[PDB]
Symmetry: D2
Subunit: 202 residues, 4 copies
């Protein structure tokens, strides 16, 4: 039931979205700082030195580039977002980034997961010690994936009509309530009039 | 039951192998020409002009580079084999090649499939209009994948103790007997003393 | 003075263009067949079997994808063109393709060269046994590059106001008159109203 | 005369080496912390918060993976080093990483530069808004490159017979004495018996 970092992507009757959640046992001292077209996962007041021992705990988890929302559990959020801003299709932007960045070199070979959505398409991917998988997000249902256990996209009836609702849901809502060690979350939602960011602190 | 081109990869109690089979409705006039560390799929006597109308029917389906055997349904066999000969790990050699080459631009957006095996590892991959998937071949069982229907690796009790047996099997043996439109096949087998090539004409 | 295959790209007071020329000592029996948004280099009547001994002599040298013209000395013309049609920027479309395809495995490790131009940008690149170089085409002057000798982009006062003129020029015009073993040429020119193809037979 | 970050790579009569130097106007408050097969560029005591405003000032500038030394002006040091440890040749390890990571998104589109050397080969590369260039390091002379001005490899008579000498030299030695705003440096040297790390504080 410990999935580590989790992300969800898809469309509802209310709009499209991207949701991210940090689950952790070793670094509970982190929060999500919202900014202009970007949400970063950063250390809490006083724990800013934690990044020099573990370089995987600080990074942008959500980037908004034009009509596209990008989400991931690491610095590859920028790598992917930059390629989209430069013109690369989603499938390749995620594929190229994950292939090059690869899994994280920690005690668990923590996979790098990501997803991206624009007005008409969405892809989700993961890179592990055993492979690279980037796949189209089904038009029928939203999906989620995590660094541990659920290392394959899985369907989800994501309920939300705003970024704050989306963040809350991946944090405590529905099936995610069961996944342990919640730390913090973030999300981007597009009601059809643009992307809006929001966060939630357990 | 029409899977198009098929390939299988894995290890037996007799050794490791790579098997390839052409299934076709439109171009039954092709055969497999064996050569030095390479097996090509070529037009039969007199049909050599077929390659100028359909550039996807002629290509090397098997390349042997050192201790590694590479198999695929297209020219990416060389792209992958060359990267292995230059030093790239299997996962990345297949991933990079498929990501760059992409699915074939024919009436069916025919996927590009591939696999590679050396003395200790094996990977198999596919790239389609909907995604890119490269995955480790399980140590437990051999696997196969095709351009149509079986676009995900699937387990198989591959029986063979030589290249000619392997080629025969993917051509008519076991579960492959059911897959229609057999045209020609090829294979590479390593009994632990090196790679050996062979072909079979229905 | 033997540069092998040559390509030029850039803009004039008459428009933008892409020019390609085959220089050869071993296979003079080839011509350029023009088609819908594509120019192929193919064997002359009766020499169609030459492609089974040397797989680098047959390929599309020019592809037109929307507002972009792509040129190269090999099958990577399609690899690059496809990525542009799927959404990849020129710099990356050429970079990714050349990095993956790499230099040709013939007696000379013949480099793979390419270039692409759209309404506002143009890049040119080359991949050899010693490196990978993709660079922006200067707005000031057109440039050319070849497989042998001139393995770095070089400035050129390309004179042409149509595809047939462009093809002629890289074939016999200006500084190219000196480069030996002319076989055949092709070109694409955009007077600002779209791309037009043409060829020239010595 | 302000080249920004600089790196040098090559071989002497004393051995092979990799040298790195930080030149800066905006963040002089940084130092080089040496570790096990790795040299990081980190903020000085008390300036640890500087990394949350400018994510390009903290990173490993040198990684030692087996018989290979890797150097770069950013986090791509790890991206490249990891691919080498996984089996990728130097040319491609640098090419793939730079192509994917791309230039840094700061006020100056600061290029990402890198180099790598093993017992028999060495490559150096750079990726900018205008291109991607990865090239073999000449056997004849060592070379250097920087983020600003010298964005092309340039020859250098690098004098050093140890890591501390190498670090000193790129910091104040020879032609580098003229390049302004020295902050800190690091280097790896192989006298033929393995890689050794060292740093120098102006």
């Amino acid at each position: 039931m410990y999935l580590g970092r989790i992300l969800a992507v898809g469309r509802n009757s209310n709009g499209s979205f991207v949701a991210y959640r940090v689950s952790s046992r070793s670094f509970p001292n982190r929060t999500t700082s919202i900014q202009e077209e970007r949400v970063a996962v950063v250390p809490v007041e006083g724990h800013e030195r934690d990044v020099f021992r573990n370089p995987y705990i600080a990074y942008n988890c959500i980037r908004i580039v034009g009509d596209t929302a990008v989400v991931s559990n690491g610095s590859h959020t920028d790598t992917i977002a930059d390629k989209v801003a430069l013109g690369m299709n989603l499938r390749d932007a995620i594929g190229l980034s994950l292939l090059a960045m690869d899994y994280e070199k920690d005690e668990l070979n923590t996979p790098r997961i990501a997803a991206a959505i624009n007005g008409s398409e969405a892809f989700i991917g993961i890179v592990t010690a055993d492979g690279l998988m980037v796949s189209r997000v089904p038009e029928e249902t939203p999906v989620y994936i995590s660094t541990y256990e659920q290392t394959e996209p899985a369907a989800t009836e994501f309920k939300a009509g705003s970024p704050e609702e989306a963040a809350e849901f991946i944090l405590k809502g529905g099936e995610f309530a069961a996944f342990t060690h919640p730390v913090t979350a973030a999300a981007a939602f597009n009601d059809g009039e643009g992307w809006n960011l929001a966060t939630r602190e357990m």
